[PDB]
Amino acid sequence: PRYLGLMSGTSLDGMDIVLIEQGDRTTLLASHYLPMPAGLREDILALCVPGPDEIARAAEVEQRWVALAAQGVRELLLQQQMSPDEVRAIGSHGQTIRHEPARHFTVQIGNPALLAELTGIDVVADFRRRDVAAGGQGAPLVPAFHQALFGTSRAVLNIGGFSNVSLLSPGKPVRGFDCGPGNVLMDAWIHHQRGEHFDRDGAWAASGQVNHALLASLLADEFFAARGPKSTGRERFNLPWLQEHLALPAADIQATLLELSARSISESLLDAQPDCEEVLVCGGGAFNTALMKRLAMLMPEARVASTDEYGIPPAWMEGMAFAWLAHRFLERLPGNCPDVTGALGPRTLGALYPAG
């Protein structure tokens, strides 16, 4: 059947909507991007830390997030000349505002009932919560999808705000984990500094020089040393965390942050899978040519290429994964990988809000 995938990751660049055909295989039929309005992006970031009146605030931000999503869904369907009745379901990741697997909770907003009401399409949402309930990290969730798409020893690497890898070693459980920062700090820094939203092509970082004293200080953070099932978010790597370390030319700090993402990816990758022959890059980090060059030279044993070479545009991989999870829900097939998340075992992920 046909599924919609609705993604809005921690970078807050915008909302991704994908349409896939699912049968034997997964095929991208169409994609649709709606940029995040500055007001909504800042209100979401404001919910990402503890604060007052969060229940009412989150409910109001939620309404706006869903209105935007449903707008995107309607535009996409009209542009593809298809009615809502041709889509089996929407896989909605929602919007994470708090991810605390050490406190056994993760909070994704995105009023799926209102999404069902606005779209006329069944919604599958709230994927991470069952994995956490079964003792897991609730992240990463893409590995089951990466395996189904690309399961030779391959690593599939997502570089969004944070980086995560899916290690596909034949005759083993799928393994994976969040490597650490992807674009999050490089975004945070060029925003604190130049007001910008990201460092295009990594050209600002390229103009700088790595500071080895800063780099080693950042690498020595406790998260990097941990092995196996691990996840992170805006809770650990953020601007106030960088400044605590900084306490030097701005461009140099930017070069150093790019290196931190390159190094924390290679070392966590090659440690867990030295035989890695192939590294498939997805997410918006795949477009950072500077970062892509550093990854190719820190893992010389493997070919470092974007998923575009293998038939999937790197920007839509995550959205495709969430549409795919709606299908898994509806077929009653497990969505997590217990050895990625550390959950007790395989679980059906999500809940169904029917259009009715």
Cite the annotated binding site by residue number: 9-16
**How crowded is residue 354: how many other Cβ atoms within 10 Å of its Cβ?**
10
**What is the spatial distance between Cα 288 and Cα 115, in angstroms, rounded to a whole number?**
33
Q: Please report how close the Cβ of residue 345 comes to ligand ADP at its closest, in angstroms.
A: 27
**What is the spatial distance between Cα 211 and Cα 213, in angstroms, rounded to a whole number?**
6
Per-residue three-class SS string for 75-107 = HHHHHCCCCHHHCCEEEECCEEEEEEHHHCEEE
Binding range to a second copy, per CB under 8 A, among 96-104, 280-288, 290-298, 304-312: 96-104
Asked if 56 interacts with a second copy (CB under 8 A), we say yes
Contact residues for ligand ADP, defined by CB under 6 A: 9-11, 13, 160-161, 183, 187, 198-202, 283-285, 287-288, 318
Q: Does residue 92 contact residue 125 with C-beta atoms inside 8 Å?
A: yes
Site for a second copy in 251-280 (CB under 8 A): none
Q: Which is nearer to ligand ADP, 88 or 92 (CB)?
A: 92
Asked if 117 interacts with a second copy (CB under 8 A), we say yes
Q: Please report how close the Cβ of residue 166 comes to a second copy at its closest, in angstroms.
A: 22
Asked if 60 interacts with a second copy (CB under 8 A), we say yes
Q: Specify binding-site residues for ATP.
A: 9-16
Q: Which of 43, 71, 105, 270 binds a second copy (CB under 8 A)?
A: 105
**What is the spatial distance between Cα 254 and Cα 243, in angstroms, rounded to a whole number?**
13
Q: Among a second copy, ligand ADP, none, what binds residue 187 when CB lies within 5 to 8 Å by partner kind? A: ligand ADP
Asked if 232 interacts with a second copy (CB under 8 A), we say no
Q: Please report how close the Cβ of residue 308 comes to a second copy at its closest, in angstroms.
A: 35
**What is the spatial distance between Cα 130 and Cα 120, in angstroms, rounded to a whole number?**
26
Q: Among a second copy, ligand ADP, none, what binds residue 43 when CB lies within 5 to 8 Å by partner kind? A: none
Q: Which residue in the block uniquely carries the two structure tokens 């899978």?
A: 273
What's the Cα-to-Cα distance from 308 to each of 63, 99, 299, 303, 313, rounded to whole Å? 34, 30, 19, 13, 5
Q: Among ligand ADP, a second copy, none, what binds residue 221 when CB lies within 5 to 8 Å by partner kind? A: none
Q: Which of 15, 134, 262, 299 binds a second copy (CB under 8 A)?
A: 134
Instruction: Find the helix or strand (DSSP H, E) in which 260 lies.
Output: helix 250-272
